[PDB]
């Protein structure tokens, strides 16, 4: 009953995570996808929150939603294939990243998060387990279930149950991410939850000898307990540390459109439909996140590889 519809469009491969995640192949294009499987009667608002955000967000550093399928018991989300693994696993594998490798990764995180804020959203659960590498070793932001329109990464105001601005909470989380990338351990860490809570509230952390003066200053600018003292996203885009070795601000605007359609992909898609080109373009432009949406976006991913 639950897998009947999904099997009309996808050939299932193995479970990789237990939401349960399955790898699969889109039958029509032959493209690999990841499928997130969530049970309705085992948080339903968290599923609807993520779906609503992903239907509205489309960006080179956000893991793309292709197709949404629903049954009485399950909701399936067909998503962009990211075989490079979690950033969390990558940092551990490397112990810690150099300042230069941290900047490569961090500029991509800044790009995705600045775009999310530009769209009127705040992620609210930024952490290395929520950033994946695709086949090109480019980062993709995942899990928009807690977004607004993990304790080690949470801003002090957010833990205290106080009112907060989502953008300020994201800037603090990005500061914790920045520290983890360059150190390979958390700035606030404890086995006891209350002792961790105390450490976050105090905002004091050890500064390893390998951190450069510029890294230390950026960390200080992001890790401010008072949210009004944290750096704004606008100032993060062209921060001196961010610009070092690059000399251009972070490109945060989306390169992945809703309006423009790719002519080659429209042609490839149209051969599978008993409709003219203009009818197919108008249907694609409705972005229903049905099989048509998945087919078009997967053909765009196939084109990108070549
Ligand atoms: O290791 C992977 N493949 C190679 C492989 C594995 C086993 C056997 C043979 N070859 C793989 C591929 C894709 C993924 N993705 C998870 C999400 C994802 C997106 C949104 N929310 C949660 C997860 C998107 N891609 C992970 C892992």
Describe the structure.
- The protein is 40% helix and 14% strand.
- The chain has 306 residues and is of the alpha+beta class.
- The protein has two domains: 6-80 and 257-305, Transferase(Phosphotransferase), domain 1, CATH 1.10.510; 85-243, Orthogonal Bundle (Transferase(Phosphotransferase), domain 1), CATH 1.10.510.10.
- A hairpin with a 5-residue loop joins strand 2 (20-26) and strand 3.
- It binds the ligand O=C(NCc1ccccn1)c1ccc(-n2cc(-c3ccncc3)cn2)cc1.
- The PDB classes it as transferase/transferase inhibitor.
- The entry lists the keywords kinase UBA domain inhibitor, TRANSFERASE-TRANSFERASE INHIBITOR complex.
- It forms a monomeric assembly.
- MELK in complex with NVS-MELK1.
Tell me roughly what share of residues is in helical segments.
40-55%
- At CATH level 3, the topology of the largest domain is Transferase(Phosphotransferase), domain 1
Task: State the end-to-end CA separation.
Answer: 38 Å
Put simply, the count of helices is 12
- Cofactors, ions and other ligands in the entry: ligand 6BJ
Integer-rounded radius of gyration: 21 Å
Sequence of secondary-structure elements = EEEHEEEHHEEHHHHHHHHH
Quaternary structure annotation:
monomer
What's the CATH architecture name of the largest domain?
Orthogonal Bundle
Question: How would you write the strand order of the largest sheet?
Answer: 1-2-3-5-4
Strand content: 5-15%
Largest sheet: 5 strands, antiparallel
Tell me how many strands there are.
8
Shape: globular
| The CATH H-level homologous superfamily of the largest domain | Transferase(Phosphotransferase) domain 1
Structural class designation: alpha+beta
> What is the C-level CATH assignment of the largest domain?
Mainly Alpha
